[PDB]
Amino acid sequence: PFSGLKFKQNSFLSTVPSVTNMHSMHFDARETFLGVIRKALEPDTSTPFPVRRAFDGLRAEILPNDTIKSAALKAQCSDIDKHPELKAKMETLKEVITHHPQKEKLAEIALQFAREAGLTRLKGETDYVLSNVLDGLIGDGSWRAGPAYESYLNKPGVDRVITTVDGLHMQR
Amino acid sequence: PFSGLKFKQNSFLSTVPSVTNMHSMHFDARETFLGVIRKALEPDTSTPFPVRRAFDGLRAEILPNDTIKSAALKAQCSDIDKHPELKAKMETLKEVITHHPQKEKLAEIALQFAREAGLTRLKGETDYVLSNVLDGLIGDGSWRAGPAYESYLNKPGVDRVITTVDGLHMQR
Amino acid sequence: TTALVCDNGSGLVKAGFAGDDAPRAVFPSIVGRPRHQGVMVGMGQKDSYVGDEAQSKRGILTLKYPIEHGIITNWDDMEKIWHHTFYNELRVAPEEHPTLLTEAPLNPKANREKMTQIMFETFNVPAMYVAIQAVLSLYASGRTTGIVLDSGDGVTHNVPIYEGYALPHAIMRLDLAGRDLTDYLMKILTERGYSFVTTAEREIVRDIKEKLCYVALDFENEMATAASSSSLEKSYELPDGQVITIGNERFRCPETLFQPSFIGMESAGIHETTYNSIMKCDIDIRKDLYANNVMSGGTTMYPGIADRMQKEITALAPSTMKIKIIAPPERKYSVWIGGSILASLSTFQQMWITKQEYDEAGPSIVHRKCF
Amino acid sequence: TTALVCDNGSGLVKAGFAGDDAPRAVFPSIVGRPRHQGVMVGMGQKDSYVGDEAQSKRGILTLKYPIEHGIITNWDDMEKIWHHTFYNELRVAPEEHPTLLTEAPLNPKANREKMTQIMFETFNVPAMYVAIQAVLSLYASGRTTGIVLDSGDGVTHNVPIYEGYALPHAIMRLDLAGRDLTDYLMKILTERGYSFVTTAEREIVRDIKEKLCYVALDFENEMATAASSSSLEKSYELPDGQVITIGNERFRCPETLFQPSFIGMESAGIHETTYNSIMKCDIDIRKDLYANNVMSGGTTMYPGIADRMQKEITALAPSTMKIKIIAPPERKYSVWIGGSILASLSTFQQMWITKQEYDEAGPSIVHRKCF
Amino acid sequence: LMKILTERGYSFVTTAEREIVRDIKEKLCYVALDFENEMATAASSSSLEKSYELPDGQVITIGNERFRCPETLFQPSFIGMESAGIHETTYNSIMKCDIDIRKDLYANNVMSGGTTMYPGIADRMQKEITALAPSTMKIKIIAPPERKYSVWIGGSILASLSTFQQMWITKQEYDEAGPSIVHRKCF
Ligand SMILES: Nc1ncnc2c1ncn2[C@@H]1O[C@H](COP(=O)(O)OP(=O)(O)O)[C@@H](O)[C@H]1O
Ligand SMILES: Nc1ncnc2c1ncn2[C@@H]1O[C@H](COP(=O)(O)OP(=O)(O)O)[C@@H](O)[C@H]1O
Ligand SMILES: Nc1ncnc2c1ncn2[C@@H]1O[C@H](COP(=O)(O)OP(=O)(O)O)[C@@H](O)[C@H]1O
Ligand SMILES: [Mg+2]
Ligand SMILES: [Mg+2]
């Protein structure tokens, strides 16, 4: 339905935030991430006008840049089974996202948020709009399992290393 | 003998090279400058045919285009006191050069060649054919001194400036 | 109702009401987001800052310009900029006022179609019109004949107008403006040991350029003068208390306007561009064009640039012609003043692109009713 | 007479004779002074130590690097290293051999002017010359076209050259190199209880980084693997006999080269800079530059970095072009190797800056005969 | 074409870019039989659009610029010139000759040179001249495939005809008459 849709090569590099800023206290891991995807799907001028107009309107309803619209959409997105059009509408975004020529770069960016910002903390109880977007990026759906963080409280390589400064002041 | 010699206003603009090419490792500032001067004195159609031809012959003898001709002229010009005809021809060239309507642009181009590419690095030991040409473009004769470059070792400002990037990797 | 005029330039936004003599809101067009990780609850709660607020907090933000060379490249940031201009600076509802926008000539056609769409859908303006910046600059000069050299932050363009008729085949455009000069000044400031790499330091360099740069009448003699003594050296204080001193860099940076080969570009200088644009007109209007050079834009107020431009054109033009440069002191706002005048004329109220006319034709309507 | 090539890097000093294949002397560029009071008389005590001898006694010394971020800071210490280089390492007299020096691009002009004065007066060399390090790297590779990424201890820079012609407006520089990584590793090693504060211990950490760190092809996947099992853990033996074990710190340290935001830098990674450098060149030479990425310097010796750069550049470049990364096994000495070749060219012998020329023009002559 | 490719965000300003745009014009442009009709079709669908690969790997697509660029041959008003189109110039060129040879000159339109190589330009020429010409007269366009080198082929013919070796100019003649001899001996 959207054949011949072209995209800019690096239009989504300037939107990803700083790696440090992904550790802020009042940081948003969903609104920022969707904004990155929203800029990634923008059709360039090379796309013909009739095809370009169709996609723009659809993106303004599933990936809006505003906050009030996103909040209102998220309210009806939890119980998605009562909106058959939204199920069919978003199902279109499955095919375009997985056919995006920059799919791999977005996936590496997508996992960057998961490792640090943690947008997939609910690991299965993710919003229908957000979980479905991630399915296009990675088809296995393994992101629901877990980002595989490290725990080393046991610390099998126990150190007990005394350095120069530690040598100056040491008890016992 | 050369009355009414009219020239194109912007004939020599297309010949002057870019500033970045002046600092080329293998750049003949002398030959490029003489080519610019040669283009600057091209007789136009408005000039009557006999004087046009005469000036073309004089220009070909004094300002050729072949490398071998330029080298031979320079070699034979070292001991110029034995060729009074060359003296007369060079004086006639000076007289028409000094009345060029575009003298100011030619003078500033000569100064740019001297400063950037070092047209006159011998500061008074320059070739005779260059000496009279430069004297025509600039009559003060001050080009014997030099471009008067700048120096930074006098420490007019003690510096000690530490910006953002320099403040991170600060030693001592 | 009162019209609105909004000159979304490459570097600064000028806005105000039609019929006023000066803009009411002037703020830099930058949108910044934090780049460090916040730690205090209840204090870090915003996502992005717009305009002067981004300038004040530039120490912990990444400043991005939503316009690059007169062409809009980040449309969400542009939506934020327009929203801020309409609501927080002018405090008006755009749904009750027609708007007049500005654009450089030879701009991609998609750029103005999206402007029309954003105005007619997101903000729901009753009507809007797009005008060429250089033409408006001539309105705010009390003239109907001349060649306009407009040079802002992104685009330097020439538009020759004779007796109200434009010669589009003689319109010259050049991508060399204030931002390129700031970048060049940043590049050559490292010769004295001052290194600026971040966006905030880019703003610092831009302020230094605005405050300490001037155009030399004769470049080579000026270079000798600065290299022989210390008369031209001046001191500037960085915001942290450090002091920097610059020398020939004062007049080397604006020199790229006349010799674009410094920054690797092949195009000719602004004077040669002006001469070429004039020489492409009809032979019977060159005499009037030489006498009515109009200069406008922020890049135009380097001290002494008018004299240098006049000298260069005099060298390029025939002797019998009279070269006159017109540089009014208010040329930072000539485009905006002209836009205010044009929207205030009684003969202009029939050329607005109305809401109904856009619905019938689509975004392609802005190509027909506008030049 | 035989020419001398002395590459004053930020970390190491590479010296030798032109025409040789490898530098004869490679010693660290540190100067150490004691920080305790001597009590035992009758044995030779020196106020300072230079080079390897300073390393062997680093338990009692305070080591200082007389070069930082590519610019020489402590001139008195810098003079000592040259004196050590000419007399104790090379066993030669500088009054007889010409010397060729190296310098990073975009350094302050005061740095190279002093290098002329300290060699024509303090050591009285017959002649000298200063060359761009990136260009010398290309000479050793036996090419005449490509884009050079030289990253040493202090400065990472790019210099694209086409058919022996450079594009100065396309030269990029970053102050992000091995010394910055060593400081980063010394910080994240505090996560497991390892503390290193003294300059003596920074040398230990610098050795840990060399023998254990590597660049992962995918950062996320590697992070999950190291967090899942203990496959990536490796052991190191400290000089006092204590043993340390590190896991994911092995590939987190060199990742800063691709994500500079770890250390607070706002600049982009090296792969984006290399791509950004190419796009500043002309359209007809981008095809050759993609296939001739040349690397040199110690910071490039990480295992797997060539593959990671190969993967990243491909994504930003169009699908049609072919990306080839050139990493010769001896690229740690590429700059010096090219230096020996260049000083051995018969054509190059006309470009020296002789002693006679310096006395006529002064230290400023180095700005004209040297790029 | 350079001034018109800016309408899609493509910018070309340097001489190497000049050669690139010239190559695009050679390889993609064509002359539309009805400019007004073709302009509607291009704005209606995307059948006319094609793709070209820039030397550095970027891909550009051009639409109505395919036939708006060569239209300047028929409407020099596009680049601001007051002169008339090439078809009307050819028509005027015939009406300035004697009445008895107009019939033959309608039937022998010979065209040559690279700019004449556009696909369909012969048919547009034929249609325009037929529109200008009287209804009885027969308009025939002769467009040999090698017309890109017609001038050189004609030079080769004329330099090999026997009756030509007496129309040369020789150094001995040059020395006597000077450079002015060229107007007297040649046309
Ligand atoms: N006094 C000044 N001297 C030199 N440059 C200036 C001065 N004032 C402003 N500028 C420069 O002019 C540039 C463009 O200003 P402006 O005319 O507002 O651009 P635009 O036309 O895009 O709105 C700014 O980037 C600024 O650096
Ligand atoms: N095998 C290696 N793996 C990782 N880093 C290395 C290796 N060998 C050397 N280095 C690092 O490279 C840095 C710079 O070395 P060098 O190339 O001599 O720099 P310069 O160009 O300044 O002389 C050193 O600080 C060192 O830590
Ligand atoms: N196949 C083609 N289609 C369209 N234009 C062409 C073609 N081949 C050549 N041209 C145009 O013809 C011009 C010159 O061709 P040519 O007839 O050799 O010129 P000249 O007669 O001056 O030698 C070129 O600028 C090119 O734009
Ligand atoms: Mg403006
Ligand atoms: Mg080095």
DSSP string, D155-168: -EEEEEEETTEE-G
Crossing angle between the packed helical segments B128-137 and B103-112, to the nearest 10 degrees: 130
On chain A, the residues whose CB falls within 8 A of the CB of C107 are none
Rounded alpha-carbon distances, angstroms, from residue E2 to A50, B99, E17, E68, E133? 26, 41, 9, 12, 35
What fold characterizes domain E1-79?
A: Actin; Chain A, domain 4 (3.90.640)
As a whole number of angstroms, the distance between CA A124 and CA A111 comes to: 15
How far, in Å, is the centroid of ligand 2 from the Cα of D257? 14
Residue C13 token pair:
């936004």
Nearest residue to B4 via CA among B57, B51, B39: B51
Nearest residue to D279 via CA among B54, A19, E56, E39: E56
Q: Which of C45, C79, C108 sits opposite A26 (nearest CB)?
A: C45
How far, in Å, is the centroid of ligand 4 from the Cα of C50? 19
Q: Parallel, antiparallel, or unpaired for β C61-64 and C31-34?
A: antiparallel
Residue D103 pairs with which residues in a beta bridge? D132
Residue E140 token pair:
């025939």
Q: Parallel, antiparallel, or unpaired for β D31-34 and D61-64?
A: antiparallel
Rounded alpha-carbon distances, angstroms, from residue C261 to A46, B20, D356? 33, 7, 34
With a Cβ cut-off of 6 Å, ligand 2 is lined by D 9-12, 152-154, 178-179, 206, 209-210, 297-299, 301-302, 332
Nearest residue to E43 via CA among E67, E27, E79, E11: E67
Residue D234 pairs with which residues in a beta bridge? D246
- Region of residue C41 (phi > 0: left; psi between -120 and 50: alpha; otherwise: beta): beta
Residue D20 token pair:
């040789």
- The DSSP letter of residue A7 is B
Residue having the nearest C-alpha atom to atom 9 of ligand 3: E114
3-class SS shares of chain C: helix, strand, coil, % to 5: 40, 20, 40
Secondary structure of A38-61 in HEC code, one letter for each residue: HHHCCECCCCCHHHHHHHHHHHHH
Quick one: CA dihedral A92, A94, A95, A97, positive or negative?
positive
What fold characterizes domain C1-30+67-130+333-367?
A: Nucleotidyltransferase; domain 5 (3.30.420)
Rounded alpha-carbon distances, angstroms, from residue C348 to C119, C128, C310, C343, E8? 19, 12, 35, 6, 30
Q: How far apart are the first and last CA of chain D?
A: 25
Given 1.20.1070.10, 3.40.50.1000, 2.30.36.70, 3.40.640.10, which CATH number is that of D31-64?
2.30.36.70
- Residue type at position D348: F
- Residue type at position D59: G
Label residue E140 exposed, middle or buried (CB < 10 Å: 0-12, 13-18, 19+): exposed
Strand, helix or coil for residue E71: helix
Asked if residue E123 has its Cβ within 6 Å of ligand 3, the reply is no
CA atoms within 13 A on the CB side of E121: 26
How far, in Å, is the centroid of ligand 3 from the Cα of C235? 59
Q: Parallel, antiparallel, or unpaired for β D156-162 and D165-166?
A: antiparallel
Quick one: CA dihedral D328, D330, D335, D339, positive or negative?
negative
Q: Parallel, antiparallel, or unpaired for β C165-166 and E59-62?
A: unpaired
CA atoms within 13 A on the CB side of D203: 22
Q: How many C-beta neighbours within 10 Å does residue E26 have?
A: 11
Strand, helix or coil for residue B163: coil
List the resolution, Å.
3.2
Nearest residue to D149 via CA among D130, D165, D133: D133
Residue C353 pairs with which residues in a beta bridge? C128
Ligand minimally distant from the alpha carbon of residue C14: 1
Q: How many C-beta neighbours within 10 Å does residue E87 have?
A: 18
Alpha helices in C62-212 (DSSP H): 75-84, 109-118, 133-139, 178-188, 199-212
As a whole number of angstroms, the distance between CA D292 and CA D325 comes to: 7
How far, in Å, is the centroid of ligand 4 from the Cα of D279? 27
Catalogue the E-assigned strands of chain A. Answer: none
Asked if residue C250 has its Cβ within 6 Å of ligand 1, the reply is no
Residue having the nearest C-alpha atom to atom 18 of ligand 2: D12
Asked if residue E119 has its Cβ within 6 Å of ligand 3, the reply is no
Q: Which of D224, D233, D316 sits opposite A147 (nearest CB)?
A: D224
Residue indicated by tokens 């306007």? C257
Q: Where in chain C are the domains?
A: 1-30+67-130+333-367, 31-64, 132-177+267-328, 178-263
With contact defined as beta carbons under 8 Å apart, do E86 and E18 qualify?
no
Please indicate whether the domains covering D1-30+67-130+333-367 and D31-64 agree at the CATH topology level. Answer: no
- Residue type at position D72: I
**Which of D188, D195, D258 best probes binding to A when mutated, by most A CB atoms within 10 angstroms?**
D195
Would you give the distance in Å from CA D101 to the centre of its chain? 14
**Which of D103, D106, D266 best probes binding to C when mutated, by most C CB atoms within 10 angstroms?**
D266
With contact defined as beta carbons under 8 Å apart, do E93 and E125 qualify?
no
What CATH number should be reported for the domain whose range is C178-263?
A: 3.90.640.10
Nearest residue to D8 via CA among D58, D78, D55, D113: D78
CATH class label, C132-177+267-328: alpha beta
Length reported for chain D: 371
Method: cryo-EM
- Residue type at position D21: D
Nearest residue to E60 via CA among E11, E15, E3: E11
Q: What are phi and psi of D46, to 5 degrees?
A: -110, 145
Q: Parallel, antiparallel, or unpaired for β D31-34 and D49-50?
A: antiparallel
